[PDB]
Structures are given as C-alpha cells and as structure tokens.
Design a protein around this nucleic acid. Structure first.
Length: 49
RNA sequence: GCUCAACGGAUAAAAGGUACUCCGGGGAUAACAGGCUGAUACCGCCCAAGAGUUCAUAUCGACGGCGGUGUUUGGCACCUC
C-alpha cells in the first residue's frame, strides 16, 4: 500500500555440503576403497527487479 | 667359546611370488547379508544470551542437556566357508 523506503534485509548463502568418510565393502571385496560421496553446493540468494 | 635377543635355545648353515595353481580342514577365523549395540548419522524435545526497529519463543535461535528410530559412518563375530 503506502510507500516506505529504507528497508533492511539479512540474507545468508547456503552452507556447502559435507562429505562422508565411508569405505566400500562388497560380496567378494573386503578391501574396496574409500567410497564417500562429496557434499552438495550451498544455496544461492538472488535479486530480481 | 652362543644379541642361541624368536632369550626352555627345531640346523653349524636358508629369502620371496603364485590371479597358472592344487589338497585337507575351519564359520575355532574375514568380506556380503541376518543378529546384538547405538559412539556417530537423522528426527524430536528442554531451558534462552541474542537477532527479529519497540517483543526470546511469527521465523531463527549461540554454550549446553534429554530421548526416539535402526537409518548412514561405526564396534562384536552368534548363524552360514
């Protein structure tokens, strides 16, 4: 409705993902290897006019 | 006269590979899976300094605490060689 300027906003970018320390063990492979997926990129805050 | 030190000392005198392998056995001993547990992982809850212009609890919520699930990373090796 009315016109009010001088707005303030707090925005935080998404924190980046966390990898996991995991090892691969299969039916016949006791020593498979370090098998841990990487994390995901954090969220990004944008501006639109 | 022995660092015969692997110290009740198998010879005075001896290192490795096998995915080309083979035999006898073991779940006495691994891995997958089941089972037990729940540190860790996930979820929820407790208090609330603070941010939220005046207002902790609209939404977040720092230092910590308490549980659930069996659900990732874990530990044991009870069943199956």
């Amino acid at each position: 409705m009315k016109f009010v300027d001088e707005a303030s906003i707090l925005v935080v970018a998404g924190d980046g993902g966390n990898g996991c320390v995991s090892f691969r063990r299969e039916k016949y492979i006791p020593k498979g290897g370090p098998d841990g997926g990487d994390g995901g990129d954090g969220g990004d805050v944008w501006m639109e006019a």
